[PDB]
Design a binder for this molecule. Structure first.
Ligand SMILES: Nc1ncnc2c1ncn2[C@@H]1O[C@H](COP(=O)(O)OP(=O)(O)OP(=O)(O)O)[C@@H](O)[C@H]1O
Ligand SMILES: Nc1ncnc2c1ncn2[C@@H]1O[C@H](COP(=O)(O)OP(=O)(O)OP(=O)(O)O)[C@@H](O)[C@H]1O
Ligand SMILES: Nc1ncnc2c1ncn2[C@@H]1O[C@H](COP(=O)(O)OP(=O)(O)OP(=O)(O)O)[C@@H](O)[C@H]1O
Ligand SMILES: Nc1ncnc2c1ncn2[C@@H]1O[C@H](COP(=O)(O)OP(=O)(O)OP(=O)(O)O)[C@@H](O)[C@H]1O
Ligand SMILES: Nc1ncnc2c1ncn2[C@@H]1O[C@H](COP(=O)(O)OP(=O)(O)OP(=O)(O)O)[C@@H](O)[C@H]1O
Ligand SMILES: Nc1ncnc2c1ncn2[C@@H]1O[C@H](COP(=O)(O)OP(=O)(O)OP(=O)(O)O)[C@@H](O)[C@H]1O
Ligand SMILES: [Mg+2]
Ligand SMILES: [Mg+2]
Ligand SMILES: [Mg+2]
Ligand SMILES: [Mo]
Ligand SMILES: [Mo]
Ligand SMILES: [Mo]
Ligand SMILES: [Mo]
Ligand SMILES: [Mo]
Ligand SMILES: [Mo]
Ligand SMILES: [Mo]
Ligand SMILES: [Mo]
Ligand SMILES: [Mo]
Ligand SMILES: [Mo]
Ligand SMILES: [Mo]
Ligand SMILES: [Mo]
Ligand SMILES: [Mo]
Ligand SMILES: [Mo]
Ligand SMILES: [Mo]
Ligand SMILES: [Mo]
Ligand SMILES: [Mo]
Ligand SMILES: [Mo]
Ligand SMILES: [Mo]
Ligand SMILES: [Mo]
Ligand SMILES: [Mo]
Ligand SMILES: [Mo]
Ligand SMILES: [Mo]
Ligand SMILES: [Mo]
Ligand SMILES: [Mo]
Ligand SMILES: [Mo]
Ligand SMILES: [Mo]
Ligand SMILES: [Mo]
Ligand SMILES: [Mo]
Ligand SMILES: [Mo]
Ligand SMILES: [Mo]
Ligand SMILES: [Mo]
Ligand SMILES: [Mo]
Ligand SMILES: [Mo]
Ligand SMILES: [Mo]
Ligand SMILES: [Mo]
Ligand SMILES: [Mo]
Ligand SMILES: [Mo]
Ligand SMILES: [Mo]
Ligand SMILES: [Mo]
Ligand SMILES: [Mo]
Ligand SMILES: [Mo]
Ligand SMILES: [Mo]
Ligand SMILES: [Mo]
Ligand SMILES: [Mo]
Ligand SMILES: [Mo]
Ligand SMILES: [Mo]
Ligand SMILES: [Mo]
Ligand SMILES: [Mo]
Ligand SMILES: [Mo]
Ligand SMILES: [Mo]
Ligand SMILES: [Mo]
Ligand SMILES: [Mo]
Ligand SMILES: [Mo]
Ligand SMILES: [Mo]
Ligand SMILES: [Mo]
Lengths: 268, 245, 245, 268, 245, 268
């Protein structure tokens, strides 16, 4: 493999050609924001709960950014579920629902950003390349809306019209795209259990698991969007994620310090 | 049970970027054909990227950039092809419309005029899926996602070859390249070699709700696009495996 | 002496967000009615916010956010209702148009097609007036401000009740709720209780230049919107106190 | 009052319902940018005068931001009055005039921002949430165009087509919305007088007055837009404003230091 | 060999900002004339800046601002004139369209409606050419650049005087001001004094590809615009020195 | 000359009037960003070459910004030449080609910015007034796309449809507009030669030359766009430019230190 061979394949072959694909795989790997951590704040699990959940997270964010560069993406939550149900009932397709759901993640980003503004932390579009705030010790964090850009071009799920790629997927892909060091999902449960702990009383906590192990246990669709787990397996940069309970005070801060709170899900 | 069709009267045509790359010799006859089609159909014409995207991939991969960096850079080449094609059709009332306009306002724009042109790339951008260093969701994929989301009457893909062969008809195995008048997305997905359409296209066909078939036709042969829009078989038909209600 | 009418041939229809909240059971008959109205009128259809805005108010007020924070968050729900309604009418040539387009380019858009849909909320945003923790200038208000600024032929408000009653017909005093076939904005402004229309609506009616009356009709009863657009009395007429020149 | 009662009212009642309105009134009050001061630079009174007025104000701004976080909004001035008169003469309504006037405040923001750029002070949209510049000691100020966003939805005045909410109102509402500590209007008179000092020779200076006292004296429409005074009475955060003469060197700086230059107008 | 004409059926009309500055007395008859022209032509109507731009130049030059600062500030005045003119024509389907829309989507917009209005200033902005402290590429220049880039059927310039004179007919030498029924761009470029059209206009005429002549007519005389659009000689014809193929 | 005379001329005369033009010439001269250096990174000459050319330039940029405020504009290169040839072959006019070429300079800015993001350097629109990054020692540089905004209003060349004002002109005019102290073009040759050094073997290096001298030697159209040289002669602020070889390690850094590497082209 050289640059010459790669460039010949790129000019002369279809992009579908396996030889071109292999040659491209050998390319160098630049990490755009290797020192950053992407964090997702759940919409339903955190922001929808209002002040008791959001205020302590704001304080953790403000403390944490002293030592940790953060990109903080927002979830959507119950308003998006409401839009999805109205639109699904009208027979609208997944691509129209995707657009509706972004508006809700945007609302949540706006509310979070207004709480963080006096601490110098902006809501941005383009979190990965908001180069200035991420470079200043006085800021060192940004907030972003966690929905992917796919809109009407959203790939539908195999069944039904609910967009399969939502804010878990949006935040994860940003972490993956920018070669971030860490991806933390902040939800309302301590992590992954052997069953849904809200429903089942005898669910057992799982500190660490691979995506394959999750699928083999039928946890494919549980605390993270199942499409996220497939993304994680194909990821180049972020080969594991951590799910933590944002309702526990200091849990985010402790996860940022390398404490193994919550569940670690590994690509392999 | 399947979603409704948003624009059932719409016809979508995806013009390959490598067709555009041939310049006036390919583009003038295509433009004359499109002109005559305008009164017959309500058209969304979407352009692919072609060779310039290969160049930006060569630069970007050399810089080490991830696949999400490469996706919008390639998309820009499709967009530029779209502006070029629209400019040639301007005197007939045709313009380039941006992705937000396509996504939210195509109905009003096709009420105003007979056809509009847009980039066939979907806005996956920095949220492009990882795994390959080449962006998987390219122009064929974007065009199909739209056509199917709209529940369009059809999607026709305009290529620089007759259709799909069993091997690249311009490649090192071109002597064994056999033309495929008809195929299913599933059969294509299970073969290994190169195709004239994105592999992600076959994936989105598997989840499609409306479009039963997509014809790939040679835009270098005048009349084939017109015939394809009338459902005449003049290229490769790809069955998506959607079935009627 | 009064300003000219910018679009005297325009009819504005405001659909309540709580009508949209009922989903397909309310929306499909409304859509079928709108479809049949399209050839009869040049329509600007504006959607309100409904229940989702209440949810974002519940979250935002709990976070302590000021009224200017809450106004654009509620407005976004009206915008989403508008996209949903437009999508159902897309096959008839109808699309959602953004506030800048409504404000500056409605003439050309209603030349292109028979109707467009937009959010009824006005862009007061962070410059919403203080005093109440709930944004005062909501969907009825925004719709009226536009209709009157345009000098439209009418504004019809489509509600989930028959019109205005002397008390909330769904509230704890609903036994004393008496239907009001006709009222003036001034009489309404001087009563204390709840209304199915913004209180700010009555304020902007007092300064209105063109629109003499606004009918509030039940969008849950097919035919009432059509009748209201023909000036038939089938809901509550609100006299704005504008008088002819 | 609890969150439960409020949330029930919010779901079950019209927003017009007095019970819901009262419950919402009891909500906590977050100030978004409590350390900032909003300043309006008059269009007609300052920027239209060019260099002799603008250059010293620029120097004060640059000195003042060392110790004071500033949001500096621009007025419109004579070009807007020209647009208003052309448009009014054609019978155009207040909402079309509002749009025309923003363009002029925008021009003024652009000219001011070009003078301030080498000092690190940006012209922004979204002054209240330009979280980064406001958080940096090296910047600590932004410039914004002072017109409200209402455009075609501008509420007209009771008579005539001149937009009643212009740049005084725009800047004030931003201060009020973001819970700023102070609102300073920078004009070309030392403050409020008992009559218009340009016209009347025996006008007496008023150091401090309430809005009610102003109305009772028929100064409802004088040095501030009369709609601003009504806004001030309904304000939650900024319950008084200060009007100062920007033509006096150091007047802005002294007002920022808590010196009682000019006129203080109080909500009550 | 010359570029193709993008919109050969287009007529471009540039209305001087100083015509707009006269207010209703000039604008109402112009509007009534434009109204009657709408069915006859496909019009792009572009407004200049007039006196407000002089005011912003007075402020900006006093602040020491460079010519690139002044160019977009003046342009904004042309844009505001355009919004005012469009508003008066709204009831006929006319709207203001932004520069990106003019540049990329004029075809579809003139399919929707008979005319649109835009700012005649070109977006040179901070990249305005240096040399003079006054922006050289103003409304006449921008209008011509567009008309010629489109290969429009014509560009007519609507002035507040009869056409070009040998001196300012409103200036201190107005007694020697002789009317010029016809002139060439080259002759004008070689004279020193003031003109009612940008000097940069003459420069872009020298490089023009399509437009053979531009008529400057008095918009204060009803009928002259209509006559000029029919190629009747009622003002000053400027020959650009383009010759037929 | 006074402000009064100027203002009378401005109200009463055509802008074409030579008396008004002379009066305007006497206006004060404000430099917006006098401490900044504008640098253009060649598209064909540098960025198209990929990593071997771009990575060392990135390192120089990162080192240089410690001591030098930089605006770094990108060229377009071979993808733009490809667009130009397709479009020219269809008979499209210069104004349509201009639009096509910006997209390519934009791509190049995006690639460069992704390399610089972790060092705090943003890609911006409005480089001249990106007041914040330019004011922070932690940043002190921005990247911009070097095409001028003219688009369809691009003035065509006397012959053919290639836009005569491209990225050399775009970057130069930004330097001129913002009154920058220095303008450096970074290409792939040590500077100007008496003939094209890629083609002619006996070309002689020219350390310093005026625009007039270049024209008299028929180098009007050589290493810089010929329209740039005319712009340079009319410039108010940047009366000379420096062309350096970005392929030579430290050449940019040395040019920023006042070392006379490359060729200095003077307006006069
Ligand atoms: N096996 C499991 N372990 C832990 N949690 C589970 C499991 N199965 C289901 N869950 C549920 O999944 C929920 C997380 O999904 P949820 O949509 O609330 O997250 P979110 O990030 O808030 O989404 P959004 O941000 O879009 O609202 C948990 O609250 C939990 O009730
Ligand atoms: N199995 C196949 N059948 C037909 N063509 C093939 C096959 N495999 C590879 N190809 C090649 O794909 C080429 C078409 O290339 P490609 O699909 O990249 O262009 P395009 O569709 O114009 O580009 P874009 O996707 O940017 O619009 C054909 O000319 C052919 O050489
Ligand atoms: N005096 C009244 N007459 C009629 N309805 C009333 C009255 N007072 C309160 N209401 C209530 O207002 C409800 C309509 O609610 P609302 O006006 O909030 O919905 P909407 O107009 O659909 O919402 P949006 O303003 O977001 O578009 C009615 O169903 C009724 O219960
Ligand atoms: N009683 C009064 N006391 C002081 N000033 C008064 C009074 N009555 C009228 N004025 C006038 O009001 C003027 C302030 O209004 P003006 O519109 O100039 O302010 P502005 O902020 O520059 O407005 P804009 O910014 O939109 O141009 C003062 O210049 C003064 O002449
Ligand atoms: N040689 C000339 N012939 C005719 N008019 C001239 C000449 N020289 C100067 N003028 C003046 O130019 C005036 C027209 O001014 P100008 O061209 O600035 O206005 P405009 O074209 O309406 O403005 P804009 O360029 O902003 O649209 C005429 O009224 C006349 O006084
Ligand atoms: N007399 C000369 N001296 C030096 N170089 C010359 C001369 N004449 C021609 N050249 C050529 O001009 C080239 C510079 O132009 P080029 O377009 O490559 O620069 P660029 O900034 O990369 O343009 P873009 O950025 O748009 O790609 C040099 O590579 C050199 O080959
Ligand atoms: Mg292909
Ligand atoms: Mg209601
Ligand atoms: Mg003129
Ligand atoms: Mo969006
Ligand atoms: Mo957005
Ligand atoms: Mo926001
Ligand atoms: Mo916002
Ligand atoms: Mo931003
Ligand atoms: Mo921004
Ligand atoms: Mo956005
Ligand atoms: Mo967006
Ligand atoms: Mo956006
Ligand atoms: Mo970005
Ligand atoms: Mo961006
Ligand atoms: Mo970016
Ligand atoms: Mo930024
Ligand atoms: Mo930012
Ligand atoms: Mo920034
Ligand atoms: Mo757009
Ligand atoms: Mo747009
Ligand atoms: Mo968007
Ligand atoms: Mo848009
Ligand atoms: Mo828009
Ligand atoms: Mo837009
Ligand atoms: Mo806007
Ligand atoms: Mo727009
Ligand atoms: Mo605006
Ligand atoms: Mo704006
Ligand atoms: Mo600006
Ligand atoms: Mo700007
Ligand atoms: Mo900004
Ligand atoms: Mo920005
Ligand atoms: Mo803006
Ligand atoms: Mo704006
Ligand atoms: Mo905007
Ligand atoms: Mo904002
Ligand atoms: Mo914003
Ligand atoms: Mo924001
Ligand atoms: Mo920012
Ligand atoms: Mo900013
Ligand atoms: Mo636009
Ligand atoms: Mo737009
Ligand atoms: Mo643009
Ligand atoms: Mo646009
Ligand atoms: Mo647009
Ligand atoms: Mo652009
Ligand atoms: Mo752009
Ligand atoms: Mo970017
Ligand atoms: Mo980007
Ligand atoms: Mo920016
Ligand atoms: Mo930005
Ligand atoms: Mo942009
Ligand atoms: Mo742009
Ligand atoms: Mo832009
Ligand atoms: Mo700017
Ligand atoms: Mo800007
Ligand atoms: Mo700016
Ligand atoms: Mo900024
Ligand atoms: Mo920035």
């Amino acid at each position: 493999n050289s640059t010459a061979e790669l460039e010949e394949l790129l000019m002369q072959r279809s992009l579908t050609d396996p030889q071109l694909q292999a040659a491209a795989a050998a390319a160098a790997d630049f990490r755009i924001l290797p020192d950053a951590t992407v964090i997702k704040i759940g919409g339903q699990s955190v922001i929808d709960r209002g002040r008791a959940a959001v205020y302590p997270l704001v304080d953790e964010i403000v403390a944490a950014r002293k030592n940790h560069k953060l990109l903080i993406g927002t979830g959507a939550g119950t308003r998006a579920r409401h839009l999805y149900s109205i639109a699904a009932g009208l027979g609208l397709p997944a691509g129209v629902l995707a657009q509706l759901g972004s508006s809700v993640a945007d609302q949540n980003a706006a509310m979070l950003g207004q709480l963080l503004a006096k601490h110098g932390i902006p809501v941005v579009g383009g979190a990965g390349l908001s180069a200035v705030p991420l470079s200043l010790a006085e800021v060192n964090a940004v907030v972003f809306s966690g929905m992917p850009p796919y809109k009407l071009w959203m790939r539908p799920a195999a069944e039904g019209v609910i967009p399969p790629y939502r804010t878990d997927a949006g935040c994860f892909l940003l972490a993956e795209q920018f070669g971030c060091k860490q991806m933390i999902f902040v939800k309302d449960e301590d992590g992954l259990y052997t069953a849904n702990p809200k429903t089942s009383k005898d669910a057992t906590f799982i500190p660490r698991i691979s995506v394959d192990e999750m699928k083999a246990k039928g946890l494919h669709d549980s605390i993270l969007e199942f499409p996220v787990l497939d993304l994680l397996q194909s990821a180049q940069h972020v080969r594991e994620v951590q799910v933590v309970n944002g309702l526990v005070p200091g849990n985010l801060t402790r996860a940022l310090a390398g404490e193994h709170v919550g569940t670690i899900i590994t690509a392999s | 049970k399947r979603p409704i069709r948003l624009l059932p009267w719409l016809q979508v045509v995806k013009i390959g970027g490598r067709v555009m790359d041939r310049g006036a010799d390919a583009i003038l006859p295509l433009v004359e054909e499109l002109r005559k089609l305008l009164p017959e159909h309500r058209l969304l014409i979407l352009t692919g990227a072609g060779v310039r995207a290969r160049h930006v991939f060569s630069v970007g991969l050399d810089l080490g950039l991830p696949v999400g960096s490469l996706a919008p850079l390639a998309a820009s080449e499709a967009g530029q092809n779209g502006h070029i094609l629209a400019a040639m059709l301007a005197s007939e009332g045709v313009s380039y419309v941006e992705h937000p306009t396509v996504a939210d306002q195509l109905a009003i724009h096709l009420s105003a005029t007979r056809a509009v042109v847009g980039s066939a790339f979907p806005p996956y951008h920095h949220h492009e899926f990882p795994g390959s260093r080449i962006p998987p969701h390219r122009a064929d994929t974007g065009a199909f996602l739209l056509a199917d989301a709209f529940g369009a009457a059809g999607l026709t893909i305009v290529e620089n070859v007759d259709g799909i062969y069993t091997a690249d008809p311009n490649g090192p195995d071109r002597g064994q390249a056999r033309f495929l008048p008809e195929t299913s997305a599933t059969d294509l997905a299970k073969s290994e070699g190169p195709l004239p359409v994105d592999r992600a296209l076959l994936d989105v066909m598997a989840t499609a709700r409306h479009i039963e078939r997509v014809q790939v036709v040679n835009g270098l042969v005048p009349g084939r696009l017109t015939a394809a829009l009338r459902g005449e078989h003049v290229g490769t038909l790809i069955r998506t495996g959607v079935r009627p209600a």
